[PDB]
Design a protein around this ligand. Structure first.
Ligand SMILES: CCCCN(Cc1cc(Cl)c(OC)c(OC)c1)c1ccc(C(O)(C(F)(F)F)C(F)(F)F)cc1
Ligand SMILES: CCCCN(Cc1cc(Cl)c(OC)c(OC)c1)c1ccc(C(O)(C(F)(F)F)C(F)(F)F)cc1
Ligand SMILES: CC1=C(/C=C/C(C)=C\C=C\C(C)=C\C(=O)O)C(C)(C)CCC1
Ligand SMILES: CC1=C(/C=C/C(C)=C\C=C\C(C)=C\C(=O)O)C(C)(C)CCC1
Lengths: 242, 198, 238, 196
């Protein structure tokens, strides 16, 4: 009982699509507004510039997720409104998976791009509240403890994008059929590559449950930013605002 | 011994032992008392510190109740059956302006339960997993609760393999209902006169 | 501007009415189920105990309200509505008056003292216990006396914006009497501390929130299948 | 003396479905709360963290007081910041009538009957804003101190400005419990990117 060629092929594509999207977006890392070096905790302006930095990288992440979704067999054959329906609601969850994948347990930070580590303090300094920061860090820590590999995050990312219950999905049955294929692949993989760690599979799926909570926490964080200056740039706005 | 550590038989017993909106709230209120009565019958839960039991139920209660009436609603067509015995139809839900979240309940939970014919033991196990949520704040020992939830994983999987050997993907199909449940849950969030005149 | 003989007399009447309620409560203390670690029974007995106490307090508030100038001259409808919503507020003011800053405990009916743990061991949650204890400690700092508490309580009772109040106009007139008296009283007895009066009135605002936090405590106790007895339920559930 | 100029406070006030019309009104005003509180004395000297906490905690009561005052003119409803109006009857038809009336009776109506003025409304909003009980405050006592400065200044203003009405100060504060209870009950590109 092992992975079929089809599943093997499908996983190779996913892993390759991720690395390639990763570089297709690398070509503009520093093209992002820089991280302040102002030594004033009370500066509203060092603070706005940190928020701008993040919204910029967040837009680069969105583009990358869209680039990766297009590489998913079946996605492009969905209606255009369905593709959007899936992407708008899956976006934050994929970014948080991506976040947990890059969590450095030693320094308690998240590395977004070589020498781009950020801890809890760095995020508070952009004006993000503690009820948003702590759960994400707790989540990334626990995710890191599973020690998933590239194939596993990639499968997990695809399962998340192909959720039939996102608001405004028309073809729920086609979306489910698509998702079933990845879930089935993940199961075979976990069972072949973690032969003496069976709970790995249910633990991975339960992470999809936590994501729904974190998404809700994230949307509260978006409202909170409005109570300040921080409006979201136009792309992030239609995805997340309302 | 997976089942021995978290007997699927006990979980089933736990389940056995227990305007539209206004009527739904009333039904919910009626079902409140069943939370403690259901939970004490779930193995190992009563061994948790009283403080943690309370936290677990405070955190899970709406998801626990939603799971239950959805499963009960399998027989009804495009609606739900309340614990009070009232039916609520799709049409009446939209007219009351909750048709958005109501449709999500029907298709993500009721219909799925119907089509796979999810049984009472499976439902009970899914509810036990919701109950044993180690991520609720103020828990005296989350790792304990987490160990318990993993015992439901293992016990539920063994049961699925035994009872439904032709459906290799069943276990995962049961778990794949929890995210939809979680999101539905988040969205869903005389005497005095005597004294006087006397 | 000062206090007239009439206002001094009204204040004295208030303090006397409250003392009188205290003695009858105290005299009726034996009626309450006695105070008994992972035991559910013990936990349920502590909750039974507290609800019994609270029923006694509700009787105190009603007896005291029946004695307020003009209260009976309102529709029974309005009397009920004023008592129903002001109940938890008056009880929290009484709690602050009885707060012991040393042991951080509250002493009811002369010889019943409870700290945070006692309330927790009855099953009450921390998001309820903490703000009340925080409120009591802050009130206690003000060092209000009998007169000041009696007036603050009467101001709370005569709140026109309580749900289901018919003659809001008359309720405001009645309240105005006591606010006027409290102002005069602070300016005569705390001549150098005029922020006292604003500060006292602002407690009325906190009670609004604390009332809401109590509602949440009630639905939470219900998650533990601990329902309020009939009288309490009528006031606090419905 | 008065280290909470009512002049500045009044300046700040000056500086700025039926349900959907209100929600849209709120969004338009959400983006003034920092500029309003900016103009309140001593607020900008508070730690940035705390400022966020005070607006996070105060925002809704802050917004409610304002549109309430504005609707002193309208007979049976509110003038929104959108320029639109909401009448009682459509509020009740929608389903938010009970909360609507509270606002009309306990706020709108009361502010008219006593003709509270922009300086007064503003001092009240400053009191709501300077709320030391909000969780996560770095220095509560600091905010406490600033709230009392508004007590003092508001009183002095009332005494001098309305010396015929000796109970006016107390009358303003007694609007705040109602505000608090009301406040508590009141709680394209993707397509292009896809194609390209
Ligand atoms: C505290 C850590 C959470 C960071 N996340 C997730 C995330 C952020 C960025 Cl910038 C990514 O690009 C590198 C990413 O891909 C790995 C994942 C996060 C997500 C969204 C936001 C915001 O939506 C908001 F509003 F919450 F601040 C925004 F983008 F606006 F910053 C903030 C943090
Ligand atoms: C943590 C301190 C809260 C105590 N309070 C106020 C209070 C309680 C009792 Cl038993 C009194 O009897 C003397 C009293 O008189 C001054 C004041 C309190 C109030 C209500 C409850 C409850 O409504 C509930 F449900 F929250 F527990 C009840 F009465 F049921 F105990 C609990 C504590
Ligand atoms: C689902 C749903 C809602 C929430 C229901 C909840 C949270 C519990 C119901 C429990 C029942 C109905 C138990 C039973 O009857 O057995 C509300 C009203 C918010 C909106 C309408 C759709
Ligand atoms: C009052 C009210 C509500 C809340 C309104 C809030 C919270 C803010 C409005 C702000 C405005 C309207 C500011 C302005 O226009 O200046 C909701 C929607 C809950 C129900 C309808 C009655």
């Amino acid at each position: 009982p092992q992975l079929s060629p089809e599943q093997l092929g499908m996983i190779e594509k996913l892993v390759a699509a991720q690395q390639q999207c990763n570089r297709r977006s690398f070509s503009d890392r520093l093209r992002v507004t820089p991280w302040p070096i102002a030594p004033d905790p009370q500066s509203r302006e060092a603070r706005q510039q940190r928020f701008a930095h993040f919204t910029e990288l967040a837009i680069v992440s969105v583009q990358e997720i869209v680039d990766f979704a297009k590489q998913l067999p079946g996605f492009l054959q969905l209606s255009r409104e369905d593709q959007i329906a899936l992407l708008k609601t899956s976006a934050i969850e994929v970014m948080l998976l991506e976040t947990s994948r890059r969590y450095n347990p030693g320094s308690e930070s998240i590395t977004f791009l070589k020498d781009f580590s950020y801890n809890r303090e760095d995020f508070a300094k952009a004006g993000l509240q503690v009820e948003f920061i702590n759960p994400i860090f707790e989540f990334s820590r626990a995710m890191n403890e599973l020690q998933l590999n590239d194939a596993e995050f990639a499968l997990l990312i695809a399962i998340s994008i192909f959720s039939a219950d996102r608001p405004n999905v028309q073809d729920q049955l086609q979306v489910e059929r698509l998702q079933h294929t990845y879930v089935e692949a993940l199961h075979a993989y976990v069972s072949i590559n973690h032969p003496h760690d069976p709970l790995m599979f249910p633990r991975m799926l339960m992470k999809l449950v936590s994501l729904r909570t974190l998404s809700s926490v994230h949307s509260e964080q978006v409202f909170a930013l409005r109570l300040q200056d921080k409006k979201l740039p136009p792309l992030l706005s239609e995805i997340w605002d309302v | 011994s997976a089942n021995e550590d978290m007997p699927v038989e006990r979980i089933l017993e736990a389940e056995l032992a227990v305007d539209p909106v206004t009527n739904i709230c009333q039904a919910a209120d009626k079902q409140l008392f069943t939370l403690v009565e259901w939970a004490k019958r779930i193995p190992h839960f009563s061994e948790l510190p009283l403080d943690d039991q309370v936290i677990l139920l405070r955190a899970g209660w709406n998801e626990l109740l939603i799971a239950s009436f959805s499963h009960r609603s399998i027989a009804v067509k495009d609606g739900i059956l309340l614990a009070t015995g009232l039916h609520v139809h799709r049409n009446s839900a939209h007219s009351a302006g909750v048709g958005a979240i109501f449709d999500r309940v029907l298709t993500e939970l009721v219909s799925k339960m119907r089509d796979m014919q999810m049984d009472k033991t499976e439902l009970g196990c899914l509810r036990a997993i919701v109950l044993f949520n180690p991520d609720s704040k103020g828990l005296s020992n989350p790792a304990e609760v987490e160990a318990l939830r993993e015992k439901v994983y293992a016990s539920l999987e063994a049961y699925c393999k035994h009872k439904y050997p032709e459906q290799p993907g069943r276990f995962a199909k049961l778990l794949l209902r929890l995210p939809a449940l979680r999101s539905i849950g988040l969205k869903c969030l005389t005497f005095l006169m005597e004294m006087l005149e006397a």
